[PDB]
């Protein structure tokens, strides 16, 4: 089957961003012209999904709620789910058992912020596969930082370790993830680690313990925009900024999206940016149309 | 009788920035490391100003009193009061005429940021007028945008125009105001202009056909960011950044200024620093102190 | 046959950047931490190009060989031919005459700065196309400042109109170029236009009225940084940093694509970055083998 | 008397910037909208002195007159002296010994970048005093790295250590020092430092230790951007470029210094800025006179 389900999870209170995030979502801060969560709402857009569950802490939901509705402007059908404490990005598949039902389940945290050429392409393998699980694999100058994917002299990926002292490659594991209906039972019985989280990497080992976690490589050609300090975020700010006032174009935005992959026609661009003539943003629509 | 007293008319709906601002208050945006009301608030800070009123929209107001509280932190007494509706700046003083009482009243705009080595010499003397009020005057490319001030070939000011087709001047005046007793009252009488609105000028105005209102000038040294739009906004959070990790230090920080005018001590800096002390803004009071 | 013969046009007085190219050339101009000059010539490598040809201006040219020799270092064969004046892009066929021989060569401005995933594959029908010749066509904000090409309802690139009133689309024609043999008579042949120039348009005209033009487009996924402004140049200058410090690897990296492409090898790697083993970038090349 | 000669420093190989200074002389690189020497130079211009010489390698010396020639377009008298090899800062006054005579003059480093409203007014004192130095310190979380010296409990020059393994204070001596006539003598007579060097600092000691030392303190209102490497030369140009576009003003730009101190008229600077109209650059002098 077709990976036709997402989750996004927009949880956190961002105590890494006060005393920013101390006063707006992260996932809700501006990236150049549009809040976080519409990067990568716009990447699970690419790959096709439109039944998207929004996660976000119970502060917060009833906020993003407000700026996406059920996303059916969009064509799209989000649902709202609670996390009354960041637990961990495992506990997602936990708090949206009930979404994901007995279908393949992809999973995009509500700061992972892509840009690049195929991206369609690249997940197209990830939202196709039957069984197993797909992560993706980023070239990063800190891989301590994040969940490193260790390579053997061959070439596939033969384990992975979770921020480790002594990162065995610099490829890290993006916020992009596509699981099997498998995932939730996984999650169900992972245990918390030492920070107390029920760690998405966990899961990943169990995948590709089976030999079934694909790890799709992302070359320097893409680019993952860091947000995790306030530097990082207006460097993506203007990155995003950069590629589209000299493109004239946006970059994943969801209207546009939904539009060019046929999710909603021109009729409804126009009811849409009807209201919205005076920003640039619904200047943008009106003229895409 | 120094000017105690100052109110943020944080509120109207800022469209201006959608999708940003959907589920988001403008004013709650950050600038680069810091909540955009930070700005203006530490404005009246600098002025000496510790007894302030945040009036903003229904929907909003609770918002700030929920990242700022009632400022006793930060050595502040902060005071909220909702707006029905935009209907001009001057209404800030109709709205909070309880709070300005007989004392003289400063009003900053809850989105305009202000950068100025000297900028505090400068209010100084606009809280030390015994009586009239005091603007302060900035040169800029967009003169028709804001309201303009003129000025004779004796350097003194003449004329105001609130959004000249025609402007007489580049300096225009930025949303910092030092009013007396005599403005609540101006407000009162004030009539809807064309656009339905209390507007600002017409007090100024009053005052200057009394000659009770001075103009502090902002010289090459100073900088008067705009937040209306998304280029600006992310122009505005990228001087900030810039010269703050350049110049080694914090623009418009509400602690360190509170700490650097005594409105609290050290140990009251190390424990608002804690929260923050995952990022610089935290470990830079903390380093402070 | 597969293009193997390139031309680097990187002359210009750089009038329109002083007085920045006063004192340097515009193609020396560091983008960041290497001079611009590296970046086309990295697009010409990654296309397997090695024997190159640099034309630039007699008062430039000299401070490009002190730059790259004849590049044997880098297993490329590196010619520099002196253009006296600007008179068009097509010249640098004329100026390359003996240079390009029977041979189909490919022409890129020393100011085109290409990013993105896949750029070879982008390239590789160009590479291979055995007559013919092939552009490339970007989404832009400002089509009028450069070529535009014309689609068909099919979407069939049709036309191209060199910096139109009214542009038939907003599609540009970037700075990388892959033109057959015949490029050479057919721009010996052009005439000077309005503004007395021997424009590439004229010469991809020929070619598509024939058939034998094609037009691939560049996603809005890759990243074209405009090099015309003091402001752009900062700005691809930050843009190619904010990919660089992330991913710790060099965009456009000669000794790197060299090293990679098997142009050169390991010990090579070590005497070319062994001068600079006092230097970042030496320890980039290092730290590569 | 009053300092009317000052040297600028601008040798070095710059091989720290390889391979952008390759073919470049670091000085003459760009940022943001002018070459780096317009920098120091600009600061001279500020301090009152016309008359400098511009100390380079022999082969970059050249260069730097091609660019600014005798200087006499902006009222300035630029003579040029050459440095073989780099034995220090101080020897730049055995080789300006010729061009210093019998009156006090100042150095200010090649590639030091200063910025500061009150600038003018601090270097002020520095150009009256009857005898002895003015030297310029900055807070620096790096003092390790340059010259520091040290405050007492009063805040006096009480200790001057050239980048001393533990720094005794977090101020930094900047590139811009103010000698009395007495320097060149001194300079003659030091003796090569532990890298074979004449060092700067020691001839500072001289005139601490005579009570004839200055310091001129840099407070948070100024900004003495590093250039040193390939990040902070981007840095400092985002600095640069983010205050002119927002504060609407060029910063360091020798003809405006030269027209506002009536060094030049306006008829001058329209023709100096003709070459330079198709810009900005040459826009604003055009539209400034
Ligand atoms: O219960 C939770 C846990 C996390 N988050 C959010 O998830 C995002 C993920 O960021 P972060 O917490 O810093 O990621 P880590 O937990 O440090 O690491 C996980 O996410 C990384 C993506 O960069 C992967 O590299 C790692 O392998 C994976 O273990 C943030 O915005 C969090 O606020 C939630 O919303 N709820
Ligand atoms: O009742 C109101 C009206 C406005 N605003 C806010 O004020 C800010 C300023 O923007 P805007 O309302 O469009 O400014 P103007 O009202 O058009 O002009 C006023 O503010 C300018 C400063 O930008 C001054 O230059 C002018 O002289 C003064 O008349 C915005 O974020 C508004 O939401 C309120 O909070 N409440
Ligand atoms: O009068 C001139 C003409 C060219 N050049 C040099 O030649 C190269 C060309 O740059 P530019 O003048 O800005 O390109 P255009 O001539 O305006 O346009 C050509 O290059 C564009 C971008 O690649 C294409 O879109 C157009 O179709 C093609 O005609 C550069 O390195 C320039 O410095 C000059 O210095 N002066
Ligand atoms: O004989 C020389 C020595 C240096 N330089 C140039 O001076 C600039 C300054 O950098 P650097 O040589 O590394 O400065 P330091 O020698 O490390 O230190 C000196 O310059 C610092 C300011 O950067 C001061 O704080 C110190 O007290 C002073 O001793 C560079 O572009 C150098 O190429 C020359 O041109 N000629």
């Known amino acids: 089957m077709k990976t036709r389900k997402g989750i996004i999870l927009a ?14 979502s992260q996932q809700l801060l501006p990236i150049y012209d549009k809040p976080m969560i519409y990067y990568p709402l716009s990447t699970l857009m690419l790959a096709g999904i439109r039944d998207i569950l929004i996660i976000s802490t119970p502060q917060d939901t009833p906020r993003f709620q407000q700026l996406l509705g059920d996303g059916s402007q969009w064509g799209l059908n989000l649902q709202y789910k609670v996390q009354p404490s960041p637990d961990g990005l495992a506990q997602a598949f936990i708090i949206g058992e009930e979404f994901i039902g007995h279908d393949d389940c992809a ?4 700061d992972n912020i892509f840009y690049g050429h195929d991206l369609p392409k690249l997940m197209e393998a990830a939202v196709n596969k039957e069984s197993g699980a797909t992560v993706f694999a980023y070239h ?13 002299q061959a070439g596939t990926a033969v384990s992975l370790e979770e921020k480790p002292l002594q990162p065995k490659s610099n490829y890290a594991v993006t916020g992009l993830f596509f699981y099997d209906n498998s995932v939730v039972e996984m999650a169900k019985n992972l245990k918390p680690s030492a920070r107390g989280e029920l760690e998405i990497t966990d899961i990943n080992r169990i995948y ?6 694909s790890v799709a490589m992302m070359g320097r050609g893409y680019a993952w925009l860091d947000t995790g300090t306030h530097q990082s ?8 900024a950069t590629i589209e006032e000299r493109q004239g174009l946006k970059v994943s935005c969801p209207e546009e999206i939904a539009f060019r992959k046929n999710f909603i026609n021109a009729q409804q661009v126009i009811e849409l940016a009807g209201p919205l003539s005076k920003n640039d943003y619904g200047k943008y629509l009106l003229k895409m149309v």
């Open 140 to 152: 990063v100058n800190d891989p301590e930082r994040y969940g490193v994917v260790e390579f053997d």
């Open 11 to 24: 949880g956190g209170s961002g105590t890494r961003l006060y005393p920013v995030t101390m006063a707006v």
């Open 233 to 240: 975020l207006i460097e993506a700010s203007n990155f995003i």
């Open 107 to 110: 999973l995009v945290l509500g």
């Open 208 to 213: 590709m313990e089976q030999g079934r976690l």
